[PDB]
Write an enzyme that holds these catalytic residues in place. Structure first.
Site, mmCIF file in Angstrom:
data_model
loop_
_atom_site.group_PDB
_atom_site.id
_atom_site.type_symbol
_atom_site.label_atom_id
_atom_site.label_comp_id
_atom_site.label_asym_id
_atom_site.label_seq_id
_atom_site.Cartn_x
_atom_site.Cartn_y
_atom_site.Cartn_z
ATOM 1 N N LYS A 1 0.826 -1.204 0.000
ATOM 2 C CA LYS A 1 0.000 0.000 0.000
ATOM 3 C C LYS A 1 0.862 1.257 0.000
ATOM 4 O O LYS A 1 0.593 2.208 -0.744
ATOM 5 C CB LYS A 1 -0.946 -0.018 1.202
ATOM 6 C CG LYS A 1 -1.625 -1.357 1.430
ATOM 7 C CD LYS A 1 -2.542 -1.316 2.639
ATOM 8 C CE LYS A 1 -1.779 -0.972 3.909
ATOM 9 N NZ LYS A 1 -0.793 -2.019 4.301
ATOM 10 N N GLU B 1 3.574 7.926 11.406
ATOM 11 C CA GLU B 1 4.376 7.111 10.501
ATOM 12 C C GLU B 1 5.655 6.631 11.182
ATOM 13 O O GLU B 1 6.205 7.295 12.065
ATOM 14 C CB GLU B 1 4.724 7.895 9.233
ATOM 15 C CG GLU B 1 5.252 7.033 8.088
ATOM 16 C CD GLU B 1 5.419 7.802 6.790
ATOM 17 O OE1 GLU B 1 5.012 8.980 6.742
ATOM 18 O OE2 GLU B 1 5.951 7.228 5.818
ATOM 19 N N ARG B 2 6.121 5.453 10.761
ATOM 20 C CA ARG B 2 7.408 4.945 11.217
ATOM 21 C C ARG B 2 8.508 5.922 10.828
ATOM 22 O O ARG B 2 8.603 6.334 9.669
ATOM 23 C CB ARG B 2 7.697 3.570 10.604
ATOM 24 C CG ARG B 2 6.735 2.457 10.995
ATOM 25 C CD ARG B 2 5.559 2.368 10.042
ATOM 26 N NE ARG B 2 4.888 1.076 10.094
ATOM 27 C CZ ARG B 2 3.982 0.740 10.999
ATOM 28 N NH1 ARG B 2 3.649 1.560 11.980
ATOM 29 N NH2 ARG B 2 3.391 -0.446 10.912
HETATM 30 N N1 LIG Z 1 5.080 -3.323 -6.700
HETATM 31 C C1 LIG Z 1 6.126 -3.738 -5.950
HETATM 32 N N2 LIG Z 1 7.367 -3.766 -6.454
HETATM 33 C C2 LIG Z 1 8.412 -4.175 -5.720
HETATM 34 N N3 LIG Z 1 8.324 -4.582 -4.444
HETATM 35 C C3 LIG Z 1 7.132 -4.606 -3.807
HETATM 36 C C4 LIG Z 1 5.941 -4.172 -4.552
HETATM 37 N N4 LIG Z 1 4.890 -4.283 -3.723
HETATM 38 C C5 LIG Z 1 5.376 -4.751 -2.548
HETATM 39 N N5 LIG Z 1 6.702 -4.939 -2.589
HETATM 40 C C6 LIG Z 1 7.532 -5.441 -1.469
HETATM 41 O O1 LIG Z 1 6.743 -5.348 -0.285
HETATM 42 C C7 LIG Z 1 7.122 -4.225 0.515
HETATM 43 C C8 LIG Z 1 5.997 -3.204 0.535
HETATM 44 O O2 LIG Z 1 6.054 -2.428 1.726
HETATM 45 P P1 LIG Z 1 4.814 -1.483 2.120
HETATM 46 O O3 LIG Z 1 4.330 -0.838 0.850
HETATM 47 O O4 LIG Z 1 5.224 -0.610 3.281
HETATM 48 O O5 LIG Z 1 3.724 -2.566 2.594
HETATM 49 P P2 LIG Z 1 2.451 -2.117 3.460
HETATM 50 O O6 LIG Z 1 1.906 -0.920 2.724
HETATM 51 O O7 LIG Z 1 1.557 -3.324 3.415
HETATM 52 O O8 LIG Z 1 3.023 -1.824 4.820
HETATM 53 C C9 LIG Z 1 8.370 -3.621 -0.096
HETATM 54 O O9 LIG Z 1 9.437 -3.596 0.854
HETATM 55 C C10 LIG Z 1 8.724 -4.515 -1.269
HETATM 56 O O10 LIG Z 1 9.900 -5.272 -0.972
HETATM 57 MG MG LIG Z 2 2.207 -0.140 4.562
#
Ligand SMILES: Nc1ncnc2c1ncn2[C@@H]1O[C@H](COP(=O)(O)OP(=O)(O)O)[C@@H](O)[C@H]1O
Ligand SMILES: [Mg+2]
Ligand SMILES: Nc1ncnc2c1ncn2[C@@H]1O[C@H](COP(=O)(O)OP(=O)(O)OP(=O)(O)O)[C@@H](O)[C@H]1O
Ligand SMILES: [Mg+2]
Lengths: 470, 475, 236
Positions: free
Chosen positions: C46, C72-73
């Site tokens: 997300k 946020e973190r």
């Molecule tokens: N479209 C994408 N391309 C590359 N890596 C992705 C993608 N979507 C998810 N990831 C992987 O998953 C993680 C997504 O983190 P984040 O967006 O913070 O997840 P959430 O929003 O669920 O907390 C990234 O660290 C990456 O390694």
């Molecule tokens: Mg997230």
């Protein structure tokens, strides 16, 4: 005496009267007020004391909206619990909780008898040994689940499956063959039933005796609570003063606990159970215990009760269900078959006569009936899966007789005369047992199944089969 | 009769003084915000704030008005958008006040009503044919979120142009942009000739949210008592229920079963019992109501849905899976019933629409089995074909209420088997072409339906539909 | 803290916003002035989607944007700041942060201060501003904590008595007048994969388009992890 208002808290009201000589708990206070100027509003209100507080304050509950109440207004105390008007003069009209008729046909004179609602239950001295069975004149009720007079009856039937027809027939029979009058007190939805009862029971004239009391959902919590107790005081007058052989009816018990759901909102105190008032069992018991037989007069306050909650493990349905004596069920699937009343072999208690006293034949017949019905149910299960034709001769004969037994259950109600045109039949219990016994004995195995419909006695079945030109 | 505010917080203030205040009286401050007195302690008053409480400070002067929660009513309100307190919202100047009435009045009692026998047309084929509604009846509408509740209500208000009705739409806690969109959609189609819209959006304080439906029903009750028929729709009672809960919690009243206090059944039943069908002695008015209730995950069994459903005379259930799959609108026969229906429905529809219900239910069960199992008997296949055509007829597009006569005629054509030849997708074209043909050829049938309220001459109707089949071109 | 816009001011016109993402553009179009929700579990992307959408919008459409981080973190905030600085997008946008180690009141008010930034941009510059919000879940949690501290009785699942009102205010000051849209993209986390918690339901009531992310897609080779069937927009 006279006391002034000091506090208002809406529905719980909590009017803290400052007074000279306090009224006892449950006493009635009446407020009269006039619009002295443009701002003030005239109000006439009645309140019931429920709690004493420090110094002179006495908490109360109002039976109507308190909008317009002003601190300082004078209050007068009547001297006794809220006095329902009761007696011969009050018979034949619909009342509110306080005692005025809602329909404006007439006004009760001041001279009439007025009695307090709250009375202790009959002492242990005046009770009577209870073994007898009240006759209903309904074959299935007199064959499978008889009613013990003086005891609470339960009927779990959905609206529109024959509840109104069943209760009309019961009150008509109890006023035709017995000296009993009925009393009805509803709390729920719309009273379209008023015109149905008007038709049939005014043709019978019982409407002039039944003193209905109504206060429904639109009312404040206090009236919705005290309506059932007004209804009970109606019966109490007959049993105490009249002392006739009037085995009267009152047609609502659980509706008091349905109102008790709102009495939980009326309390304004420490919660308990599932949000319920702590005094649920005591509050319901106080009502339930006033229904008794007695030796003062031949008045049994036997009541037929419908439970809208229909949830087993909930504390309020369980607490109410603990007091019930007999049970009956109305189901739509049986209504589909044209067998009326739509009551199934479900039963409860009612063994005070059979087999306790002698009741041998009655008890054995009932047991055989239920056994045959359950066997027919399992045979019907088998028939759909594989087919009836493969059943053995001795097992097929069971279905053969079961069809007749199932169809004989129907009764041509008297109240149905204005729709069906059938004059209606009344059956004594002994006649029901004696006649039905031959059916189990196979006296009339050869007769067509269609003859066994909407007839009072077995000879009527035989003559109907003959009239079919066998 | 002057006082001072001694405490303020989250909408519930307290005041010192006000000797002669009356419980429920409207009270106002030097700021100009209106307040409802609710509790009168021995020396201080508990005031609920109706408006922005930020401006209030302790020490502010408070003045009583002398009225007991009166809401202005009149003829001027037709076509307007107003606040529950009665203030104009859409500009256009101040509305004229014919008279002012309280909102705490008693409902119409027993023995002063009458059994319902007058139809109310929504304009949706499925609803009008399967689940009729009568004037004075209360019918609840439940469904999953985003299932077309508002579309159905707008269709009903739009169709009510022909039949005399004063419609009042109450928006409780709805998003403001959607409220304005619905207001404009009613401005077109001329629906603002009679409709009144009452709005109290999410931004409004909870007291206004819980007060809104009471004010709407109070406004409708005046046209009820003068003799005019009324149709009131509550967009969502759940917002009123939640806003009630919040006010009680802030006032420190203990919760009930759920966080909701025990009062909610009384609160909502007092509202819903106020709609009634009056008798000749009282002027013969009527007030239909169509409340809406939100459902999560399509689970009917819950506190609010059962609590309200115990009050109403029936309910209609809309499934989201059927709706999204392409069956729009979507109603389930199993959960939807109308207990007062059948007496209001005109005899023509009662005669026409007998076998349609059985066809729908039996066909749907058989279709479930068939999609489970391919191999089938010939009679079952014919039943499937008939049910498929029946499903095709029931489909209706957006914002197009259909007059009853075309409904009964097309249902007759469906049931008699004339429509069976037409392919699935061609059925809708057949339907609209048949409406055009009815406008073209069979006018006397339509006028006889209007005047008689019963099915017209059957032979000529058969000839007309046969002639349309002869003219219609398949594929 | 400012009184909301009135009824007469608001407009009703619908304008589609193009994102350049195949799934979003095809099966769930976003609308100017409308609120768009992103739902999903942990570790599904997300934040990656919202960040890449910010970059894409600033690259192609070129409109102003505002980012509000509600609790946020610190690590994720710093990584986002460095990534946007490298991207050359920071100059076009604006960011406000409310850190987790701060009292709940600040984490509640940070979204409102971001909204005030977008408010001034839309009122004086009269253009299509965008507002991104990191997570509304922590906004509701901060509201509950502030209520508990202040001494108000709990309700629902431990939530504050006044929840619907606060959510309504925060999402009803975000309205598209004739002058400017203030479109918002908002992300929300599902605590236990159940769409019934009071905060997700209250926010769910307010959305024009919802896009829900699944962990199964995220662990599959399919990026982004957007479920086609369960994601819908009322502008389709
Ligand atoms: N479209 C994408 N391309 C590359 N890596 C992705 C993608 N979507 C998810 N990831 C992987 O998953 C993680 C997504 O983190 P984040 O967006 O913070 O997840 P959430 O929003 O669920 O907390 C990234 O660290 C990456 O390694
Ligand atoms: Mg997230
Ligand atoms: N018969 C129909 N055919 C096609 N589309 C329809 C039909 N009925 C409704 N719709 C569409 O479905 C959507 C229903 O939106 P609506 O606002 O009525 O939903 P709702 O279930 O009342 O939800 P909410 O309570 O969130 O407002 C609209 O986009 C409308 O155009
Ligand atoms: Mg809607």
């Amino acid at each position: 005496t006279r006391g002034r208002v000091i506090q208002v808290m809406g529905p719980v009201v909590d009017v803290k009267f400052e007074n000279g000589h306090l009224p006892a708990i449950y006493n009635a206070l009446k407020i009269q007020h006039k619009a002295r100027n443009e701002n003030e509003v005239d109000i006439d209100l009645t309140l019931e004391v429920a709690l004493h507080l420090g110094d002179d304050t006495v908490r109360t509950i109002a039976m109507a909206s308190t909008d317009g109440l002003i601190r300082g207004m004078e209050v007068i105390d009547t001297g006794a619990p809220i006095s329902v008007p009761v007696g011969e003069v009050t018979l034949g009209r619909v009342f509110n909780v306080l005692g005025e008729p809602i329909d404006l046909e007439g006004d009760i004179p001041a001279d009439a008898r007025r009695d307090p609602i709250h009375r202790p239950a009959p002492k242990f001295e005046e009770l009577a040994t209870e073994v007898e069975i009240l006759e209903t004149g309904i074959k299935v009720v007199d064959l499978l689940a008889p009613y013990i007079k003086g005891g609470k009856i339960g009927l779990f039937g959905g609206a529109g499956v024959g509840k109104t027809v069943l209760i009309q027939e019961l009150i008509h029979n109890i006023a035709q063959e017995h000296g009993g009058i009925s009393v009805f007190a509803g709390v729920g939805e719309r009273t379209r039933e008023g015109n149905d009862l008007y038709h049939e029971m005014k043709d019978s004239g019982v409407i002039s005796k039944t003193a209905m009391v109504f206060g429904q959902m639109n009312e404040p919590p206090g009236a919705r609570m005290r309506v059932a107790l007004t209804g009970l005081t109606m019966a109490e007058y007959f049993r105490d003063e009249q002392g006739q052989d009037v085995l009267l009816f009152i047609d609502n018990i659980f509706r008091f606990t349905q109102a008790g759901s709102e009495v939980s909102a009326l309390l304004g105190r420490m919660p308990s159970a599932v949000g319920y008032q702590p005094t649920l069992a005591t509050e319901m018991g106080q009502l339930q215990e006033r229904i008794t037989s007695t030796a003062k007069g031949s008045i049994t306050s036997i009541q037929a009760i419908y439970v809208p909650a229909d949830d087993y493990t909930d504390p309020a349905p369980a607490t109410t269900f603990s007091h019930l004596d007999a049970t009956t069920n109305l189901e739509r699937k049986l209504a589909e078959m044209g067998i009326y009343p739509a009551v199934d072999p479900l039963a409860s208690t009612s063994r005070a006569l059979a087999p306790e006293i002698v009741g041998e034949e009655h008890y054995q017949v009932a047991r055989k009936v239920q056994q045959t019905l359950q066997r027919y149910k399992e045979l019907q299960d088998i028939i759909a899966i594989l087919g009836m034709d493969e059943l053995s001769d001795e097992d097929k004969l069971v279905v053969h007789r079961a069809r007749r037994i199932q169809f004989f259950l129907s009764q041509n109600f008297h109240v149905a005369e204005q729709f069906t045109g059938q004059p209606g039949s009344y059956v004594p219990v002994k006649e029901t047992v004696r006649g039905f016994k031959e059916i189990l004995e196979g006296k009339y195995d050869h007769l067509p199944e269609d003859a066994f419909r909407l007839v009072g006695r077995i000879e009527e079945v035989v003559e109907k089969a003959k009239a079919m030109g066998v | 009769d002057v006082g001072t505010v001694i405490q303020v917080g989250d909408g519930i203030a307290r005041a010192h003084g006000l000797d002669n205040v009356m419980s429920g009286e409207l009270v106002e401050f030097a700021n100009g915000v209106m307040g409802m007195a609710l509790n009168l302690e021995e020396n201080n008053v508990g005031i609920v704030i109706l408006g922005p409480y930020t401006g209030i400070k302790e020490g502010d002067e408070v003045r009583r008005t002398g009225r007991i929660m009166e809401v202005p009513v009149g003829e001027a309100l037709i076509g307007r958008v107003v606040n529950p307190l009665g203030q104009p919202v859409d500009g256009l100047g101040p509305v004229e006040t014919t008279e002012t009435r309280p909102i705490e009045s008693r409902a119409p009692g027993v023995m002063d009503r009458r059994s319902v026998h007058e139809p109310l047309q929504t304009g949706i084929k499925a609803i009008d044919a399967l689940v009729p509604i009568g004037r004075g009846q209360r019918e609840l509408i439940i469904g999953d979120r985003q299932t077309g509740k508002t579309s159905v209500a707008i269709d009903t208000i739009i169709n009510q142009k022909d039949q005399n009705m004063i419609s009042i739409y109450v928006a409780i806690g709805q998003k403001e942009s959607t409220v304005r969109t619905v207001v404009e959609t009613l401005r077109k189609h001329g629906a603002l000739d009679y409709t009144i819209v009452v709005t109290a959006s999410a931004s409004q304080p909870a007291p206004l949210l819980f007060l809104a439906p009471y004010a709407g029903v109070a406004m409708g009750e005046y046209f009820m008592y003068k003799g005019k028929h009324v149709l009131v729709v509550y967009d969502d009672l759940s917002k009123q229920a939640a806003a009630y809960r919040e006010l009680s919690l802030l006032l420190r009243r203990p919760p009930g079963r759920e966080a909701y206090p025990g009062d909610i059944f009384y609160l909502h039943s007092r509202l819903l019992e106020r709609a009634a069908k009056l008798s000749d002695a009282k002027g013969g008015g009527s007030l239909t109501a169509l409340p809406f209730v939100e459902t999560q995950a399509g689970d009917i069994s819950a506190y609010i849905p059962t609590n309200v459903i115990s009050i109403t005379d029936g309910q209609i259930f809309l499934q989201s899976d059927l709706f999204f799959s392409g069956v729009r609108p979507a109603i389930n026969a199993g959960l939807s019933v109308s207990r007062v229906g059948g007496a209001a429905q005109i005899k023509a529809m009662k005669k026409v629409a007998g076998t349609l219900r059985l066809d729908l239910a039996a066909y749907r069960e058989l279709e479930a089995f068939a999609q489970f199992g391919s191999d089938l008997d010939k009679a079952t296949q014919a039943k499937l074909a008939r049910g498929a055509r029946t499903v095709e007829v029931l489909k209706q597009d957006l914002h197009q209420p259909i007059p009853v006569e075309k409904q009964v005629l097309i249902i007759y054509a469906l049931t008699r088997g004339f429509l069976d030849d037409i392919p699935v997708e061609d059925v809708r074209r057949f339907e609209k072409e048949f409406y055009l043909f009815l406008d073209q050829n069979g006018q006397h049938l339509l006028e006889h339906i209007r005047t008689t309220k019963d099915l017209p001459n059957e032979d000529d109707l058969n000839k007309a539909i046969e002639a349309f089949k002869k003219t219609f071109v398949v594929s």
